[PDB]
Amino acid sequence: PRKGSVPKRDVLPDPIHNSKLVTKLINKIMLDGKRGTAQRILYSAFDLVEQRSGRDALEVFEEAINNIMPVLEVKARRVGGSNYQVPVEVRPERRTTLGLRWLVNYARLRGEKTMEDRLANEILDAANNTGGAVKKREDTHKMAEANKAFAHYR
Amino acid sequence: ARIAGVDIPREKRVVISLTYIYGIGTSTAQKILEEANVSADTRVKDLTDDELGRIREVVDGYKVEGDLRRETNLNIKRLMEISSYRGIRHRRGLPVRGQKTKNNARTRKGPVKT
Amino acid sequence: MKQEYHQVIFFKFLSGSTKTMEWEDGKEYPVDISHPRQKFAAADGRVERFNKKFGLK
Amino acid sequence: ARSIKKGPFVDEHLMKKVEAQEGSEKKQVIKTWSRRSTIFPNFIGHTFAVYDGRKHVPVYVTEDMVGHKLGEFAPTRTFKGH
RNA sequence: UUGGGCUACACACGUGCUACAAUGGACAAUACAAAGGGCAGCCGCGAGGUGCAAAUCCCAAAAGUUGUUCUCAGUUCGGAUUGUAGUCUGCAACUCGACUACAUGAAGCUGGAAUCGCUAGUAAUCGUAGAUCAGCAUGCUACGGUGAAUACGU
Ligand SMILES: [Mg+2]
Ligand SMILES: [Mg+2]
């Protein structure tokens, strides 16, 4: 807003993995306020991850998120008759937002029948540096380094 | 397999597969499988010959398929022949149950003709 | 004829076909619709339907 | 539909017109405004000039019309176009 | 005053409701609200039929949770349309009411250009009540349940 920045809301750590990042993930999964469904999907997906990989689900999930979170983004700008996509650095809080948003958005587009299956495979894929959410991050860096000459705009 | 002259789907449970017969819905299929003592969860490819015979005998007591199509067509023909209000709507291709035709009569009328 | 199709048994009666049970002949062969009774009574008619519905004799 | 316990509705004035001709052969047209009267079995063979809002249109009753309203055979709207 | 029309129907536009399904459908069991209204007013598969003038009695939660089943199919999604048989109100449901049961089972598999709302108990979603009112609410007004994401900056 014009006045200035607004304080953000904290969340509680999840009861199983004691993780605030996991709680924020459940909120991204959740539709129409149906939290129980979102929690059920997330915890079922983490069981699938833990046994399809052999590791802790949370440990795989932090690896997967680190491969989705971008370091540079592009911002639209109007510069006297030529729109310029200025590359900027993503702030740490926005990195987590995009990591969780891209993970859920590209898990929703997959072909597995259930969302717990889709989310678990996205996490396993992103932890191997593949999948739709990792590609979306790659295309964001590919759009940014193609404009790193325009870093002098603001 | 073939029950009332129709080859109902082989891979589904009987309650569902029976609904592929013209004249049998969900509730009729349930009562047919209660009358003829066949479990609803049986796949029709797993129906025994005796179980299939009992189904065909109960189904024989219902008006289905071409007998039901003839009866329905005779009813519409009677309405048109006596030139009732409904019979006129049937011939004109318009809704017959008092629905408004200024908008939203596409099912009876078809695609829009701009 | 040039050089399958056997005598299958389809009530029961002998027949020839390719879509392949002891008989009085003593041999065995590969073995719904009996086609319609009155099945269903015909339409009552509007007068009779009216009288029966309202009990008007 | 009308409740069966209430029977089939017919206006009393129209029914007396039908019964007044009962036991005759030279039936005469019955002019009526009662579009809401059920056609009874004793209406068969009779003609009813039924008001459609501006004129009485003839409705000759056959057996297949029994149980319908008289108004169902006197259309009230005119449409032949767009 | 009786009857008809305001409900027409090749189309065009606005506002909504229901869907296109697996974060779902069907079946079974089991929890948790708020705000209001009320005098001749608050056996049948079914719609329905035969104590209280109010913190007292009635109208009267769903989403949710736990299980079973369906297995990606225009289908066990969808319930438009139509046939038949009924219930109730009303003198009277043809034009032209609401609801129920059986059958039928349309378009529709996330929507071009473009365009709308919303900054927190909000949006989204789920039910509830009232006025009008014999009968008729996907509209209006009101009530709670679950309940987000984001705001770097001009
Ligand atoms: Mg109007
Ligand atoms: Mg359904």
UniProtKB/Swiss-Prot annotation, chain A:
Answer yes or no on keyword Metal-binding. Answer: no
**Gene Ontology cellular component list:** small ribosomal subunit
The Gene Ontology biological process terms listed for this entry are: translation
Superkingdom, natural source? Bacteria
Enumerate the UniProt keywords alphabetically: Ribonucleoprotein, Ribosomal protein, RNA-binding, rRNA-binding, tRNA-binding
Q: State one Pfam family annotation.
A: Ribosomal_S7
- What are the protein's GO molecular function terms? rRNA binding; structural constituent of ribosome; tRNA binding
Extract the signal peptide range.
Answer: none
Q: How does it assemble?
A: Part of the 30S ribosomal subunit. Contacts proteins S9 and S11.
Family per UniProt?
Answer: Belongs to the universal ribosomal protein uS7 family.
Q: What does this protein do?
A: One of the primary rRNA binding proteins, it binds directly to 16S rRNA where it nucleates assembly of the head domain of the 30S subunit. Is located at the subunit interface close to the decoding center, probably blocks exit of the E-site tRNA.
Q: What is this protein called?
A: Small ribosomal subunit protein uS7
Organism, per UniProt? Staphylococcus aureus (strain USA300)
Curated annotation (Swiss-Prot), chain B:
Pfam families reported for this sequence: Ribosomal_S13
The record's GO molecular-function terms, alphabetically, read: rRNA binding; structural constituent of ribosome; tRNA binding
Q: Where is this region: Disordered?
A: 90-114
The source's domain of life comes to Bacteria
Share an example GO biological-process annotation for this protein.
Answer: translation
Whether Ribonucleoprotein counts among this entry's keywords is yes
Cellular component, GO annotation: cytosol; small ribosomal subunit
Q: What keywords does the record list, in alphabetical order?
A: Ribonucleoprotein, Ribosomal protein, RNA-binding, rRNA-binding, tRNA-binding
The record's comment on protein family reads:
Belongs to the universal ribosomal protein uS13 family.
HAMAP family per record:
Ribosomal_uS13
Q: What does this protein do?
A: Located at the top of the head of the 30S subunit, it contacts several helices of the 16S rRNA. In the 70S ribosome it contacts the 23S rRNA (bridge B1a) and protein L5 of the 50S subunit (bridge B1b), connecting the 2 subunits; these bridges are implicated in subunit movement. Contacts the tRNAs in the A and P-sites.
Provide the assembly information.
Part of the 30S ribosomal subunit. Forms a loose heterodimer with protein S19. Forms two bridges to the 50S subunit in the 70S ribosome.
Q: What is this protein called?
A: Small ribosomal subunit protein uS13
Q: Which gene encodes it?
A: rpsM
From Swiss-Prot, chain C:
* Single GO BP term: translation
Keywords (A to Z) from UniProt: Ribonucleoprotein, Ribosomal protein
Q: Does the keyword Metal-binding apply?
A: no
The keyword Ribonucleoprotein is assigned to this record? yes
* One MF term in the entry's GO annotations: structural constituent of ribosome
Superkingdom, taxonomy of origin: Bacteria
GO CC annotation:
ribonucleoprotein complex; ribosome
- PANTHER family this protein is in? 50S RIBOSOMAL PROTEIN L31, CHLOROPLASTIC (PTHR33280), LARGE RIBOSOMAL SUBUNIT PROTEIN BL31C (PTHR33280:SF1)
By sequence similarity, the record places it as follows: Belongs to the bacterial ribosomal protein bL31 family. Type B subfamily.
This protein's assembly is summarised as:
Part of the 50S ribosomal subunit.
- Name of this protein: Large ribosomal subunit protein bL31B
UniProtKB/Swiss-Prot annotation, chain D:
Q: Report the function annotation for this chain.
A: Protein S19 forms a complex with S13 that binds strongly to the 16S ribosomal RNA.
Task: Kindly indicate whether the keyword rRNA-binding belongs to this entry.
Answer: yes
Gene encoding this polypeptide? rpsS
Molecular function (Gene Ontology), one example: rRNA binding
* One Pfam family hit: Ribosomal_S19
Family assignment? Answer: Belongs to the universal ribosomal protein uS19 family.
Superkingdom classification of source = Bacteria
Q: Native species of this protein?
A: Staphylococcus aureus (strain USA300)
Q: Which InterPro entries match?
A: Ribosomal_uS19, Ribosomal_uS19_bac-type, Ribosomal_uS19_CS, Ribosomal_uS19_SF
Organism lineage: Bacteria, Bacillati, Bacillota, Bacilli, Bacillales
- SUPFAM superfamilies per record: Ribosomal protein S19 (SSF54570)
PANTHER family the record matches: RIBOSOMAL PROTEIN S19P FAMILY MEMBER, SMALL RIBOSOMAL SUBUNIT PROTEIN US19M
This protein is called what? Small ribosomal subunit protein uS19
Q: Which GO terms describe its cellular component?
A: cytoplasm; small ribosomal subunit
Q: Which UniProt keywords apply?
A: Ribonucleoprotein, Ribosomal protein, RNA-binding, rRNA-binding
- Extract one GO BP annotation from the record: translation
PROSITE patterns (alphabetical)? RIBOSOMAL_S19
